[model samples]
Target: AQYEDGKQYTTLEKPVAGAPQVLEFFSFFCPHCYQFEEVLHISDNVKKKLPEGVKMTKYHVNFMGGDLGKDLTQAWAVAMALGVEDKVTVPLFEGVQKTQTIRSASDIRDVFINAGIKGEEYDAAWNSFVVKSLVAQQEKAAADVQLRGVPAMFVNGKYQLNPQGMDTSNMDVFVQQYADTVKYLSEK
Candidate 1:
């Protein structure tokens, strides 16, 4: 069966994309969100199929991890600014969701520091106007979407995709179909 709107996806009343792009709302402390990035690599595969310049943008929501949520969100914004998400995403995910090693902003800073980012550099990005603005933007974006949960992917910021009905008996099938569905909805 084809991926049907409303059944497998929902169209937004107010489209959020400025261009054809995938906007993902995720929280690093979430297990499923961690799986999406680390285990499943959904974002990587999805990006491969997307047309050139169609960005896969991620926003870290501040509703999870209790008090540490905002701190981690700010940390993620700093990671993005420093171009070290590749180095720290999995570590931070493991620390927060799996290892329970991260407990405060300093712990988050350690993740960046261990990733080879200097303390001063991390501090600069952490307090810069651009990073602060980005953190606030992520918070507002989550609110604007009335985000129900973590690991939500919207294509062109209008179609919220759901993979429930897809054959998910195995990892390969699931990820391929998930990427295909994202590709299909993205073109529309």
Candidate 2:
């Protein structure tokens, strides 16, 4: 079959700005998200297959882990603002989904500290207007898409990837097909 609307993807009513953008909605508390990053290495693999100038944007969803969800999102925002996502994504994922040691924002702060970010820097970014606005915008983004689950991907803010339409028999093949689809949708 082909990647068609209502099949492999769905066209959003209110498409997000920025062309060729890959916006991913995930939660640190989600095992699937952790598996995707650590086990499958989906982000890195798929990104390499995509065309140049295609930006990958991650928005942490605030619907999981009660109030902690919001806090995690805030922490993610801080990481993004500090340009330290590369250092924190896996550790944060492990802290929340695997070790289960991260029970609060303080724990998240510690993760940043261990990731080489100074406590003062993290504190400043955590309270910065830009980070706060980014957190709020992330919440708004989740709402805008009416997202219902973790690890959801949208291309160009319009096409939402529907895994059911892709070959899921093997993860390796699935990642290839996912890259193909995202690349296909990016050009649309």
Candidate 3:
């Protein structure tokens, strides 16, 4: 079930080592991203089926910097680094996609609150230099991969799967294809 090149996905120049990394490059403001959140929110999805030693990671991309872009991206980096991403990711999307008022750090903090996370927990990580560095790193990784849009998935850090205009009726097939590729790469 090898996916075709230049169609379903494309290969990366270098594969991620230690463990294969599945990275979802996204923006909080993108409507497409809101819809794509379903898979990540589930417990028995790709993240669980990942081959042993594989890593499932996501990063926020802020190509649109105004509005809540800076605050959301910054907040995301902090959550991811502080080991609270699983706690905050879905609610951040749900709240913002519902209200879309995430204009400042305060707004993002409130999103965490709605998700049952305390404000102090977010404050401890939100504006730190470590958070900023990771934010920078994620943006650069997006650039290195030549990613120009949202809702892109990187398999093992080498292949990019852009779901733009893809049919949603058969995501299971798509996921299986990606899983196949992930396993193939792992054995290589």
Candidate 4:
């Protein structure tokens, strides 16, 4: 794949906290993406067991569009810029998995407000330069990577792992193993 580095998407150019960075490409509407959430939370502990430098950033992928997808992506970009990525991640996933309500930008904002982020702050972040730049970067990444499905993950910059064609029972194990691979390779 031909990634355009920082121009195509927000690459964690340097390690934060001495850990190799793990970036996930996912979509709100993907059931597999939802399924991976629990594993993601659990992986935090496993990540902690690593030799000092490993972090994960989930990049919400948006390819489909209704008014809803665009708005949700916008809201997500804002949340990311404001350093409240988890705030949006938790509620959006919960709403998608637990409730039948429509998941849209406005709906997501409601969740943000419920989570105690001010509505105005959310609005401003949504339109901020950081968010816009990130979104454009993502578009470039999708094209560069030639992504074929939702819920993909890449470690460092090149290892691509997906939950396809593997034994379903061992998917989590595979993911963690790949993550470990990235961490190991990054050190060298």
lDDT string for model 1 (11-71, tens) is 8898775633788888888888888888889989988888777788888988887789989
For each candidate, what TM-score against the reference? 0.94, 0.92, 0.79, 0.72
Winner by TM-score: 1
Off by over 4 Å in 2: 13-20
Superposition TM-score, candidate 2 onto the true structure: 0.92
Clashing pairs in 3: 12-158
**Model 2 local distance difference test score:** 0.86
Write down the RMSD of all candidates, one decimal each. Answer: 1.5, 1.7, 3.2, 7.2
Structural RMSD, model 3: 3.2
Q: Compared with the true structure, what per-residue lDDT tens digits does model 4 show for residues 41-66?
A: 43353365446655666566667545
**Number of colliding residue pairs in model 4:** 5
Query: Model 2, poorest ten-residue lDDT window?
Result: 13-22
Q: Give residue 72's error in model 3 in angstroms.
A: 0.9
Worst 10 residues of 1 by lDDT: 14-23
Ranked by TM-score, top first? 1, 2, 3, 4
- What lDDT is obtained when candidate 3 is compared to the true structure? 0.69
List pairs with backbone clashes in candidate 2. none
lDDT winner, 1 or 4? 1
Q: Give me the runs in candidate 1 sitting further than 4 Å from their true place.
A: 17-20
lDDT of 3 by residue, 96-122 (tens): 777666667787788777777777877
